[PDB]
């Protein structure tokens, strides 16, 4: 009559966004119990950063156009919505972008800053087609969790929908194992696919902490 407490045995990183985490050893009937709860917590409660306000000097609203840029303002906002950033010790930060001349205006054009980190510099925001044309934007980045619509939340400030969740796909599996000559045990393998913002072990530990904090209340008093 002894329970074996699982431990995180190794971490594998196939790519910069696809990772695999293995927990071992687990008792019979506990692999699914842990996996489903971990998936439901990870897919909905992970914190992250996103874009909430974008301000361009030469525009007034989203349904307008600027000379020299191929895309509309709406498509520029839709491209900025997908930006992946990391912030270390600040809740809200301001980023500036300035460009001139023909070329793809991408994420690497953002002014380099000490604490803000960019994950995919090759992500494209817009295109410039005229030599004399130039673009300058300011971006506000906050921190939070969940999906916060703009409607729920000075002329020239454009509000964009915020998707704070940094996790895109979770897939767990339970496999047979032979740990200590006990055939009842098994191992749990979790595959995470994110945008490259949150480290796998930190996310797993945060999910476990959330579930334990929620479980604290079930000591009846």
């Amino acid at each position: 009559t002894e329970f074996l407490k699982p431990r995180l045995v190794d971490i594998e990183q196939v790519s910069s966004t696809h990772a695999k985490v293995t927990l071992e050893p687990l008792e019979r009937g506990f692999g699914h119990t842990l996996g489903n709860a971990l998936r439901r917590i990870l897919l909905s409660s992970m914190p992250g950063c996103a874009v909430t306000e974008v301000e361009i000097d030469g525009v007034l609203h989203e349904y307008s156009t600027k000379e020299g840029v191929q895309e509309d303002i709406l498509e520029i906002l839709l491209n900025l919505k997908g930006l992946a950033v990391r912030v270390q010790g600040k809740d809200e930060v301001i980023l500036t972008l300035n460009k001139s001349g023909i070329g793809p205006v991408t994420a690497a054009d953002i002014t380099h800053d000490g604490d803000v980190e960019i994950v995919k510099p090759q992500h494209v925001i817009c295109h410039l087609t005229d030599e004399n044309a130039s673009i300058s934007m300011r971006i506000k980045v906050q921190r939070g969790r969940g999906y916060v619509p703009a409607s729920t939340r000075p002329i020239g400030r454009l509000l964009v929908d915020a998707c704070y969740s940094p996790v895109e796909r979770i897939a767990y599996n339970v496999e047979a194992a032979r740990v200590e000559q006990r055939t009842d045990l098994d191992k749990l393998v979790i595959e995470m696919e994110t945008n490259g913002t949150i480290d796998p072990e930190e996310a797993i530990r945060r999910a476990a902490t959330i579930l334990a904090e929620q479980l604290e209340a079930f000591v009846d008093l």
Partner: peptide, 28 residues
């Protein structure tokens, strides 16, 4: 008072027409 009920958006275009002879005032 003039924007109706619950629909809410952004003003994207404003056109003005005045009767001929009368001089345009202010914004027009």
């Amino acid at each position: 008072l003039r924007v109706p009920n619950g629909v809410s958006g952004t003003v994207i275009d404003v056109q003005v027409f005045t009767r001929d002879g009368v001089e345009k005032d202010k914004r027009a």
